[PDB]
């Protein structure tokens, strides 16, 4: 089998991407944030504290003839941005772009933190990291991809995120029309539960390529590109007036600037992020200070190839017995 679904930016900045997902019988369609940096499929629901729902579409298990309470199971997750959610668990039928999994753990939120409430466009998350990170207790549950894998034509999914435009998540096949050149594959460590790999270096604008190993994660659920402070300083030093602002929380730059590109290495191959992809707009409405799309990972503990980087590439998440990642230009 295969599946194919369009993923759409939630706003004019590509702050995140939502993909429609069918849950239950009859189908309830919710718009979920596909997150290769986590491993829980959780949704706003009829059980979510009413004051914490503000415009999201909710899953109502009582209206699904295929929903079953997973007795005794609870979940609770905290994300790198400080947000969190928790609740109980049902199993139900879940379909993405025509690909159906029966018995998928659907984690129903009883509580969500303020940032989820305040974002009316995201109805939940669909985790696509390794199932070892799933938070369901006392019986850990498998991701949608893990449950579907055996049925897929090939044990892969691909992320093709757009810049200020829709893109595509495919399951089970690699669309050879969706990229240019060849796909370069690179090793993955699953030891932290992530799609963790090692970039071979970087360049800023038309500058020379610096060969240096940068370990990080391919994370569709993180907006920006988070890299070591040395790399980030080298980038922003090429933008007149750019500076790191502790009050704003990262590098800002004059909105009048033209940003240089940023290249990252995948083995001997190179992915070029155009400068425009690094512009996240005014820090506050009407400001002439703009927020940068490349930020330091120094306070995180891991480098993160978020949407800023991934949207410049066609990315293969290869879930073969030994997982690997593939990147192609497009």
UniProtKB/Swiss-Prot annotation:
The keyword Isomerase is annotated on this UniProt entry: no
GO biological process: proteolysis
Active site: 35, 199
Gene encoding the protein: EAPA
EC top class named in words: hydrolase
Key words, A-Z: Aspartyl protease, Disulfide bond, Hydrolase, Protease, Signal, Zymogen
Covered range of the whole protein: 90 to 419 of 419
Reactions performed catalytically: Hydrolysis of proteins with specificity similar to that of pepsin A, prefers hydrophobic residues at P1 and P1', but does not cleave 14-Ala-|-Leu-15 in the B chain of insulin or Z-Glu-Tyr. Clots milk
Native organism: Cryphonectria parasitica
E.C. code: 3.4.23.22
Alphabetized GO MF terms: aspartic-type endopeptidase activity
Assigned protein family: Belongs to the peptidase A1 family.
Official protein name in the record: Endothiapepsin
């Amino acid at each position: 089998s295969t599946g194919s679904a369009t993923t759409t930016p939630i706003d004019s900045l590509d702050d995140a991407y939502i993909t429609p997902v069918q849950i239950g019988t009859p189908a309830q369609t919710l718009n979920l944030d596909f997150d290769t940096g986590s491993s829980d499929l959780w949704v706003f629901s009829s059980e979510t504290t009413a004051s914490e729902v503000d415009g999201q579409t909710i899953y109502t298990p009582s209206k699904s003839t295929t929903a079953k309470l997973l007795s005794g199971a609870t979940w609770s997750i905290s994300y790198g941005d400080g947000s969190s959610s928790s609740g109980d668990v049902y199993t139900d039928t879940v379909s993405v772009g025509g690909l159906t999994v029966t018995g998928q753990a659907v984690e129903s939120a009883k509580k969500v933190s303020s940032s989820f409430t305040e974002d009316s466009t995201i109805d939940g998350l669909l985790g696509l990291a390794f199932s070892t990170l799933n938070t369901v207790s006392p019986t850990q549950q498998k991701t949608f991809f893990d449950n579907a894998k055996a049925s897929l034509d090939s044990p892969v999914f691909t992320a093709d995120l757009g810049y200020h435009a829709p893109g595509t998540y495919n399951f089970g096949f690699i669309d050879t029309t969706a990229y240019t050149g060849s796909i370069t594959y690179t090793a993955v460590s699953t030891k932290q539960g992530f799609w963790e790999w090692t970039s071979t270096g970087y360049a800023v604008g038309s500058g020379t390529f610096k060969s240096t190993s940068i370990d990080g994660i391919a994370d569709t659920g993180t907006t920006l590109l988070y890299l070591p402070a040395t790399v980030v300083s080298a980038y922003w030093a090429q933008v007149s007036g750019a500076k790191s602002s502790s009050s704003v929380g990262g590098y800002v730059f004059p909105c009048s600037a033209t940003l240089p590109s940023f290249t990252f290495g995948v083995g001997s191959a190179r992915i070029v992020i155009p400068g425009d992809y690094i512009d996240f707009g005014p820090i506050s409405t009407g400001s002439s200070s703009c927020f940068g799309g490349i930020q330091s990972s120094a306070g995180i503990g891991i480098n993160i190839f978020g949407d800023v980087a991934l949207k410049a590439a066609f990315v293969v998440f290869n879930g073969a017995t030994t997982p690997t990642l593939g990147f192609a230009s497009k």
